[PDB]
Amino acid sequence: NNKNTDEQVTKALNLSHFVGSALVVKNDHVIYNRAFGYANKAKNQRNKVNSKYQILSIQKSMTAVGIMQLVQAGKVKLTDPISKYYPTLKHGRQTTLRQMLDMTTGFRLKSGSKEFLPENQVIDFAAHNVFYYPDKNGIYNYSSVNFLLLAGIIRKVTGQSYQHFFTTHFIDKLNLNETGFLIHGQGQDATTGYRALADQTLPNYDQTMPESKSQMANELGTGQVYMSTADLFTVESAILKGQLLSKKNVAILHTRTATGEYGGGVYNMSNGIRSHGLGYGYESSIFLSPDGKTGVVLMSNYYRKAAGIQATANKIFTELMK
């Protein structure tokens, strides 16, 4: 029952010290939709169901889909070497687009620019400053620069910005009204990130988390977007239902590797897909069934390592799936 569901999920969230918005869908029907704690404590603004949160690394699933759309259009191939798009790279030149999508490259960018740069200069800074580790080639190892460099390929091949691509193929395509780029401001129902102590569980809101324009620009392709929980579910479900990309091409994209569950910008699990993001005081979590009909989205503006939301979403999803 929805009464049962409401009591059980609210208890799980309360015991885990949840701050943010929670959405639970079963067989295409919303069965739980509630918010907890504060979007901004100093202004006495409560989080709401349609509050906007950082999707963080979950954005990489969307960058991946963009690449695979270009594959279907005949404009790139997953076998392409990175040097085809970045001809001044010194090392790792043989690395394929497939490996970039699967976090099986030896690339790592230690830091982005401290300056606020436009997209083309963010891309150039990465290509000039990335390190290459031959012993990490072909083995799962999480490295965000892979997806920033994928965002640069979208820009190069299309002749338009990544923001323009994202706006066209996600925001406009799916009529998203609670989604955008953090650099331009969140608008109504904005949230503020909070900084926690290592062992903190109870929220206290005594320290806000800054993010610079530089930090937001440097998350090109990788964690620069805000969404409501509804908008995030709409996107991920639309992917798996084959509304953005044929189901044949989703199947190609979303394939695990020999060394990891990660493939095509998501974790390919035993019972659907998972994506997790952390950064800037925020945490994001989605678990979704393979057919896109049943899942859980939690997003928080008050990340606490001692009260992580992914574990909570995992518990909810496991119960949901039986």
Residue numbers in the entry: 72 to 393
Describing publication, verbatim:
(a) The dltE gene encodes for a 397 residues protein composed of a transmembrane segment predicted between residues 12 and 34 and a larger C-terminal extracellular region from residues 34–397 and named DltEextra. The domain consists of two subdomains, an α-β sandwich (residues 76–126 and 246–397) that form a five strand (β1–β5) antiparallel β-sheet flanked by 5 α-helices (α2, α9–α12) and an α-helix-rich region (residues 127–245) folding in 6 α-helices (α3-α8).
The positions of the active site S-X-X-K motif (128SIQK131), containing the catalytic Ser128 and Lys131 residues, and the catalytic Tyr213 from the second motif are conserved. The position of the catalytic Tyr213 from the second motif is also conserved and found in the loop connecting α5 and α6, close to the catalytic dyad. In contrast, several striking features distinguish DltE from DDCP and more generally from PBPs and DD-carboxypeptidases. The β3-strand that usually bears the third motif and defines one side of the catalytic cavity is not conserved in terms of length and position. The global architecture of the active site cavity of DltE is therefore reshaped and different from that of DDCP enzymes, adopting a deeper cleft topology largely opened on both sides of the protein. The catalytic Ser, colored in red, is buried at the bottom of the catalytic cavity in DDCP and lying in the middle of a large cleft in DltE.
